[PDB]
């Protein structure tokens, strides 16, 4: 079914560091999902609260 | 105390932390049981039929509020009273609710945000999210201001939003939800013309004070709901009552018996310990324009600089460096030789490997040794990477003290996570002052569990956190324990200088149990466990004392030209005699350096008249 | 441009200067053509048939007001808006009108204060002053403060020969004269419980701002009648806008664009040059004892001492210094060449003779050497003679700085008049800062005509004056003229040591 | 008949300096009469403005 997300547009590829990228269409913005144990708007900071 | 427990607020613009079930957890443990969330209120990625009855208490949000991609039908975010909007999502809006529906078209249903009254800054954006009902008829000019009212972009359209109409007891059919309760409590367009701020009822007789923000319970600065600028023991003042009042009948500054210190939107009797106390009575975190700080008997002030004073750089995320989020090889040409970083230090594994997303070159791993000059760090120190050669933290060799004013994630001032370094090597590190320390996720790093961090901290209440690094039972196997000299007070590493207090004698930094004295070849002497070098002009002793002073005047045993009490390699060869005359001293019957008859004003270099040609 | 001319206001409580014509003729100079009185208001002994035209323009008296022992038809003290009450009379009163009748019982029949709104401090006492009426029924709670209502007493009484009533239209006949124009404007009791300060009209849609002290002209922080506390450019503020604003998010302090240096109940863009600015902009006269006055970058400052602060001597007239008016023989010991006299130097021909009514022994002249090298005096110097053997100002020798904080009579700093001293001296005084220097009453004193005071004080806008001294042709062929080898710079004395 | 001015009570003998002292009956407080060229509460200062 039609979802929000199309694959990362390669305009902002390798956008985040510790996570997988995905581009949503409901605003034309990239918003990636981090790996486990990370935070941040670019999945850059390490989760220290564990 | 009586105050309200605070969260720290998320800062994930649009980001899924793991999966729909892991993300829901990073919400819960972050936003459970708190009332004054201090950074933001992202409620994002909740999925259908996930309980959210813990948002019934957030009574302030000192930052924007993002509700985006939420599929639960009901978000109980009711008791929220004011969104101070210190920082805007999308750099304009301060309450965004956008695209809250899945593929099946069953997205957000109702936002019973009843008691939301005032937004101190910023517009409000809304976007496609059907099943959202009743909010399409709220009155905005009451909630928001008037100038910022030209940026909002609300856009309501729903299909299954068959939600019933709101009860007729409330104006213009304006309502958050359904029932008599959910209907827009008006307090800023029903005011009487003579009123300037908040009110209640068109009666010009029961307005609110000038500083209340939501509402009031009587016109008074003591009966507001939420204060607009400052507050001191239930009083929404506009500026903390200063310390010294002016007396125009005598022109001399009096003393205010109610002088309080303005510390970040509250008036306090005394600033905290690690905070500067300036002259205006306002607690600061970093006060340098031309001047610098210095100790004043337990309370740090920052007096004036005498022209040329030492350098200071700006931290990460402050002033210049804000579009950058680490220290990469385009914002390192600033930390050239500054000895104190006003701010905070990030080292993420983006600088070394570089990245093209923000136009950063791949920083050479050697440029990092510039930071050898850093001594005091105001904020926190976060490290999660290091060049793939170094074995101990080298560039931070002589870090004196970590002030820890602003702490990463709210508790961690020092944080070294996911590193490959045999052992720390931070050897100076006097007095980590506030905030906790986390050193984990390290592959091969073991010594650090030996130090006594209970003494290293500053303000008590701290707590260390050291797990998930190379086991002690594996470093003792390879014998990676510290030098036998170091006292039972810790050892940052295996090199015999990494101790913190040597066994018996110390060479300033390097440890030696028995330095050289009455037996021993190098000429030096001990002084309160410090091996200091006496003047080398003396002769190597074997029986009695060498000396007790740095100068040679105590070199008793000497095999050179003995300058009376002193002893030098040759008797003085250019010292001035009387009345600014150059005089070469000669040797007496004991080879001593002594003067002669004042007759021969050009010195006395001979026995009698054989050195003054007659 | 919107400023108002200012009077200084006398302080001679009940004494009369000379005769009833001279007294009045001095009372014609002081108070002629001015709105605000920066001092006190004494009007006493203006006898009958004398005119009081000028006395209507007075708009505010920043002290107390005394109307006693005068017998005249009326006192057209009409537009007096407010009486601050900074000082007081009898330590409790701010307006007192006592005993306005002579033998003829003609007295004062009408005190027309139509629009006196508020007395900011202290009680008010109308002692027995017959032949006065139409001021015997005003409601006083409207003008006096709340607590000071207990500290007052009215002794109004009159034989009441005529004294008609006024128009019954104005509230409870509480008028100060004839008609409604001369009737009270009571704007503190007829207000709504929704207003806390003054108001105008019973309605709560127009009640005055919480800072205006008399009335209002469209409720706002500006447009008051008289500012109660401070004033910054036609706005009755409560504290001048500071220069540094504590940004409660970044914990720093920001430069405020509207910086206002507080300066004695008015906010000004920059303190006067001879004033020492503290850290947060506010003019002050003498920095606190913890600090020492250091000058840097033009205008002066004051920072903490290096331990043992130098001794400062506060002049007579401030602090505990009111049980004595000049430096009598019970205070000289409290001076040890401070070099930094702060404010006054009150040395009058009254110490040397002593007086018993004030419980003082006669001063001996030998102990006037403590002031041998007083380097700087901030405010002003008041001398009128010496012990008549010393033939020059021998104590004040190394004095150099006269800055002018508390100028005498608001117009004078170096006051040396009425002595018999051949050459005054002052071999080292080179730093007059403000005020005026006056040497006009010495029978035998003929060197002060030579100095070019233009270089004595900067801050152009001052003018000295020298009269009634030995004519230049008198002491020319006498032995007292500027020295021969001396330089064309003036002769503070006859010799080369003072050629400067 | 009401001699509003009576002579200085001699309890304040030479109360003021530069002018005759004289007392009052209705208020019981003296009002010195300063000479010409003198001002002040007890005739202290020389009139410097004049």
Supply the DSSP string of C343-365, one letter for each residue: S--EE-TTTTT--TTTT-PPPPG
Decide if C197 is inside a domain: no
Distance of CA B234 to the CA centre of its chain: 29
- Phi, psi dihedral angles at B393 (to 5 degrees): -60, 110
Count Cβ atoms below 10 Å from residue C46 Cβ, excluding itself. Answer: 22
Overall residue count recorded for chain B in this entry:
614
Burial of B576 (0-12, 13-18, 19+ CB in 10 A): exposed
Burial D36-49 (b: 16+ CB within 10 A, else e): eebbbbbbbbbebe
First-residue to last-residue Cα distance in chain D: 37
Q: Contact B30/B60 with Cβ under 8 angstroms?
A: no
Partner-chain residue, chosen from B13, B98, B441, that has the shortest CB–CB distance to A41 = B13
- Phi, psi dihedral angles at B372 (to 5 degrees): -60, -20
Strand partners, C82: C60, C118
Measure the CA–CA gap between C97 and C126, rounded to whole angstroms.
5
User: Residue A34: helix, strand or coil by DSSP?
Assistant: strand
Measure the CA–CA gap between C272 and C262, rounded to whole angstroms.
11
**For residue D33, which of C22, C75, C358, C355 has the smallest C-alpha distance?**
C22
Strand partners, C89: C93
Measure the CA–CA gap between C86 and B538, rounded to whole angstroms.
81
Name the residue range of residue C464's domain.
Answer: 310-500
Instruction: Please give the C-alpha separations between residue B441 and each of B385, B418, B446, in angstroms, as whole numbers.
Output: 11, 4, 12
**For residue A3, which of A26, A28, A35 has the smallest C-alpha distance?**
A26
Q: How many CA atoms lie within 13 A of B590 on its CB side?
A: 8
After which residues does chain B break, using C–N > 2.5 Å?
Answer: none
Decide if C256 is inside a domain: yes
Tell whether A46 is within 8 A of chain B (Cβ): yes
Q: Contact C393/C419 with Cβ under 8 angstroms?
A: no
**For residue B189, which of B180, B179, B177, B198 has the smallest C-alpha distance?**
B198
The tokens describing C453, both together, are: 């005071």
Tell whether C16 is within 8 A of chain D (Cβ): yes
Decide if C221 is inside a domain: no
> Which helix (DSSP H) or strand (DSSP E) does residue C293 occupy?
strand C291-295
Count Cβ atoms below 10 Å from residue C452 Cβ, excluding itself. Answer: 9
Q: What share of chain A is helix, strand, coil (3-state, %, to 5)?
A: 0, 30, 70
Instruction: Please give the C-alpha separations between residue B559 and each of B158, B566, B592, in angstroms, as whole numbers.
Output: 104, 12, 11
The tokens describing B327, both together, are: 């220290």
Contacts of D13 in chain C (CB under 8 A): 357
Q: How many CA atoms lie within 13 A of B71 on its CB side?
A: 15
Partner-chain residue, chosen from A1, A39, A49, that has the shortest CB–CB distance to B12 = A39
Tell me how many degrees the CA angle B35-B39-B42 measures, rounded to the nearest 5: 85
Decide if B180 is inside a domain: yes
d(CA B123, nearest CA chain A) in Å: 18
**For residue B413, which of B374, B392, B451, B382 has the smallest C-alpha distance?**
B382
User: Residue C134: helix, strand or coil by DSSP?
Assistant: coil
Q: Contact C239/C267 with Cβ under 8 angstroms?
A: no
Give the end of a domain, one of B186, B221, B243.
Answer: B186
Strand partners, C376: C340, C401
Contact C357 D27 (CB under 8 A): no
Residues B333 and B437 reside in one and the same domain: yes
Domain count, chain D: 1
DSSP category for residue B552: G
Strand extents, DSSP E, B179-288: 261-262, 267-268, 276-277, 283-284
Contact B252 C288 (CB under 8 A): yes
Torsion angle of C-alpha atoms B444, B447, B449, B453, degrees rounded to 10: -120
Decide if B30 is inside a domain: yes
Strand partners, C61: C37, C83
Torsion angle of C-alpha atoms A41, A42, A43, A48, degrees rounded to 10: -60
Residues C80 and C28 reside in one and the same domain: yes
Decide if B219 is inside a domain: no
Residues C44 and C84 reside in one and the same domain: yes
- Phi, psi dihedral angles at B160 (to 5 degrees): -85, 0
Measure the CA–CA gap between C194 and B208, rounded to whole angstroms.
11
Contacts of C244 in chain B (CB under 8 A): 280, 282
Strand partners, C119: C83
d(CA B223, nearest CA chain C) in Å: 16
Measure the CA–CA gap between C148 and C135, rounded to whole angstroms.
19
**Residue C30 CB partners (closer than 8 Å, separation 6+):** C7, C8, C9, C10
The tokens describing B249, both together, are: 């009948």
Closest residue, chain A, to B415 (C-alpha) = A48
The tokens describing C126, both together, are: 């109308």
If contacts are CB pairs under 8 Å, which of residues 21-40 in chain A contact chain B? Answer: 24, 26-27, 29, 31-36, 38-40
Q: Contact C130/C107 with Cβ under 8 angstroms?
A: yes
Measure the CA–CA gap between B574 and B576, rounded to whole angstroms.
6
**For residue B129, which of B100, B153, B109 has the smallest C-alpha distance?**
B100
**For residue C128, which of C101, C90, C102 has the smallest C-alpha distance?**
C101
Measure the CA–CA gap between B451 and B429, rounded to whole angstroms.
12
Strand extents, DSSP E, C202-275: 244-246, 253-255, 261-262, 267-268
Count Cβ atoms below 10 Å from residue B604 Cβ, excluding itself. Answer: 21
Partner-chain residue, chosen from C193, C252, C279, that has the shortest CB–CB distance to B279 = C279
Tell me how many degrees the CA angle C231-C234-C235 measures, rounded to the nearest 5: 60
**For residue C186, which of C236, C119, C116, C134 has the smallest C-alpha distance?**
C116
Measure the CA–CA gap between B56 and B604, rounded to whole angstroms.
100
Residues C413 and C478 reside in one and the same domain: yes
Contacts of B86 in chain C (CB under 8 A): 249
**Residue B481 CB partners (closer than 8 Å, separation 6+):** B447, B475, B494
Q: Contact B302/B340 with Cβ under 8 angstroms?
A: no
**For residue C80, which of C38, C112, C116 has the smallest C-alpha distance?**
C116
**For residue C151, which of C120, C123, C121, C126 has the smallest C-alpha distance?**
C123
**For residue C149, which of C139, C135, C157 has the smallest C-alpha distance?**
C139
Measure the CA–CA gap between B408 and C12, rounded to whole angstroms.
71
d(CA A10, nearest CA chain B) in Å: 10
Residue with structure tokens 């005190």?
Answer: C111
Instruction: Please give the C-alpha separations between residue B356 and each of A10, A11, B353, B361, B539, in angstroms, as whole numbers.
Output: 12, 10, 10, 8, 67
CATH of the domain at C6: 3.80.20.20
Measure the CA–CA gap between C133 and C163, rounded to whole angstroms.
7
What would the 3-class secondary structure string for B79-114 be?
CCCEECCCCCECCCEEEEEECCCCCCCCCCCECCCC
Tell me how many degrees the CA angle B224-B227-B233 measures, rounded to the nearest 5: 80
Residues C7 and C155 reside in one and the same domain: yes
Measure the CA–CA gap between B23 and B17, rounded to whole angstroms.
5
DSSP of D1-50, one letter per residue?
---SEEE--STTTT-SSSS--EEESSS-----EE-TTB-TTTT-SB-S--
Q: Contact A42/A15 with Cβ under 8 angstroms?
A: yes
Q: Contact B347/B327 with Cβ under 8 angstroms?
A: yes
Contacts of C86 in chain B (CB under 8 A): 249
Overall residue count recorded for chain D in this entry:
50
Q: Which own/partner pairs from C157-160 qualify as long-range (CB within 8 Å, at least 24 positions apart)?
A: C157/C128, C157/C130, C158/C130, C158/C131, C158/C132, C158/C133, C159/C105, C159/C130, C159/C131, C160/C133
Sort strands B340-342 and C93-98 into parallel, antiparallel or unpaired. Answer: unpaired
**For residue B371, which of B418, B415, B316, B413 has the smallest C-alpha distance?**
B316
Tell me how many degrees the CA angle B443-B445-B446 measures, rounded to the nearest 5: 130
DSSP category for residue B282: B
Domain count, chain B: 3
Contact A49 B104 (CB under 8 A): no
Strand partners, C282: C262
- Phi, psi dihedral angles at C143 (to 5 degrees): -95, -50
Contacts of B193 in chain C (CB under 8 A): 205
**For residue B102, which of C487, C108, C285, A24 has the smallest C-alpha distance?**
A24
Q: Contact C14/C68 with Cβ under 8 angstroms?
A: yes
Measure the CA–CA gap between B572 and B562, rounded to whole angstroms.
10
Decide if B531 is inside a domain: no
Overall residue count recorded for chain C in this entry:
500
Neighbouring chains to B with at least 3 Cβ pairs closer than 8 Å: A, C
Count Cβ atoms below 10 Å from residue B353 Cβ, excluding itself. Answer: 11
Contact D31 C69 (CB under 8 A): yes
The tokens describing C454, both together, are: 């233009």
Measure the CA–CA gap between B533 and B515, rounded to whole angstroms.
10
Give the end of a domain, one of B143, B166, B186.
Answer: B186
B and A interact (at least 3 Cβ pairs within 8 A) = yes
Give the end of a domain, one of B134, B168, B186.
Answer: B186
Overall residue count recorded for chain A in this entry:
50
Partner-chain residue, chosen from D2, D34, D48, that has the shortest CB–CB distance to C17 = D34
Decide if B516 is inside a domain: no
| Resolution of the experimental model, in Å, one decimal | 3.6
Q: Indicate which of B103, B155, B357 best probes the interface with A, i.e. most A CBs within 10 Å of its own CB.
A: B357
Strand partners, C383: C347, C416
DSSP of B133-174, one letter per residue?
-SGGG--HHHHS-SSGGGS-------SS--PPPPPTTSGGG-
Measure the CA–CA gap between B465 and B372, rounded to whole angstroms.
26
Q: Contact B185/B81 with Cβ under 8 angstroms?
A: no
Measure the CA–CA gap between B546 and C431, rounded to whole angstroms.
64
Name the residue range of residue D4's domain.
Answer: 1-50
The tokens describing B338, both together, are: 């500054």
């Amino acid at each position: 079914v039609v979802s929000h997300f199309n694959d990362c547009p390669d305009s902002h590829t390798q956008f985040c560091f510790h996570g997988t990228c995905r581009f949503l269409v409901q605003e034309d913005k990239p918003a990636c999902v981090c790996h486990s144990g990370y935070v941040g708007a670019r999945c850059e900071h390490a989760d220290l609260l564990a | 105390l009586e105050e309200k427990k605070v969260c720290q607020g998320t800062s994930n613009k649009l980001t899924q932390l793991g999966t729909f079930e892991d993300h829901f957890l990073s919400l819960q443990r972050m936003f459970n049981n708190c009332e004054v969330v201090l950074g933001n209120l992202e409620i994002t990625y909740v999925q259908r039929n996930y309980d959210l009855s813990f948002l019934k208490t957030i009574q302030e949000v000192a930052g924007y509020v993002l509700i985006a991609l939420n599929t639960v039908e009901r978000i109980p975010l009711e008791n929220l009273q004011i969104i101070r909007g210190n920082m805007y999502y999308e750099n304009s809006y301060a309450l965004a609710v956008l695209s809250n529906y899945d593929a099946n078209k069953t997205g957000l249903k109702e936002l019973p945000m009843r008691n939301l009254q005032e937004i101190l800054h910023g517009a409000v954006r809304f976007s496609n999210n059907p099943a959202l009902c009743n909010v399409e008829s709220i009155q905005w000019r009451d909630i928001v201001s008037s100038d910022f009212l030209s940026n909002m972009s609300m856009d309501f359209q729903n299909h299954l939003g068959s939600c019933q109409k709101c009860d007729p007891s409330c104006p213009n059919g304006s309502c958050w939800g359904a029932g008599e309760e959910n209907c827009q409590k008006l307090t800023k367009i029903i005011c009487a013309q003579q009123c300037s701020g908040r009110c209640r009822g068109k009666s010009p007789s029961d307005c609110c004070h000038n500083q209340c923000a939501a509402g009031c319970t009587g016109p008074r600065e003591s009966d507001c709901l939420v204060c607009r600028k400052f507050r001191n023991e239930a009083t929404c003042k506009d500026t903390c009552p200063p310390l010294m009042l002016y007396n125009p009948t005598t022109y001399q500054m009096d003393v205010n018996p109610e002088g309080k210190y303005s510390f970040g939107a509250t008036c306090v009797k005394k600033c905290p310990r690690n905070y500067v106390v300036t002259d205006h009575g306002s607690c600061v975190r970093a006060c340098g324009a031309d001047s610098y700080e210095m100790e004043e008997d337990g309370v740090r002030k920052c007096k004036k600089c005498e022209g040329p004073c030492r350098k200071v750089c700006n931290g990460i995320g402050i002033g210049e460096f804000k579009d950058s989020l680490s220290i990469n090889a385009t914002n390192i040409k600033h930390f050239k030789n500054c000895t104190s970083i006003s701010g905070d230090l990030h080292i993420l594994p983006v600088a070394f490997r570089g990245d093209s997303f923000t136009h950063t070159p791949p920083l050479d791993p050697q440029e990092l040794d510039i930071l050898k000059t850093v001594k005091e760090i105001t904020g926190f120190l976060l490290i999660q990477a290091w060049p793939e050669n170094r074995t101990d933290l080298h560039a931070f060799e002589n870090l004196e003290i970590i002030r820890g004013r602003t702490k990463q994630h709210g508790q961690f001032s020092l944080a070294v996570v996911s590193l490959n370094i045999t052992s720390l090597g931070l050897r100076s590190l006097k007095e980590i002052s506030d905030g906790d320390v986390i050193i984990s996720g390290n592959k091969n790093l073991c010594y650090a569990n030996t130090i006594n961090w209970k003494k290293l901290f500053g303000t008590s209440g701290q707590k260390t956190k050291i797990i998930s690094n190379r086991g002690e039972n594996s470093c003792k196997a390879t014998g990676q324990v510290c030098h036998a000299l170091c006292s039972p007070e810790g050892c940052w590493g295996p090199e015999p200088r990494d101790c913190v207090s040597c066994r018996n004698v110390s060479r300033g930094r390097e440890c030696v149990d028995k330095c050289n004295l009455l037996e021993g070849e190098p000429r030096e002497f001990v002084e309160n466990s410090e091996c200091i070098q006496c003047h080398p002009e003396c002769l190597p002793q074997a029986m009695n004392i060498t000396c007790t002073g740095r100068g040679p005047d105590n070199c008793i045993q000497c095999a050179h030209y003995i300058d009376g009490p002193h002893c030098v390699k040759t008797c003085p060869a250019g010292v001035m005699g009387e009345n600014n005359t150059l005089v070469w001293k000669y040797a007496d019957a004991g080879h001593v350096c002594h003067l002669c008859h004042p007759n021969c004003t050009y010195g006395c270099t001979g026995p009698g008249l054989e050195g003054c040609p007659t």
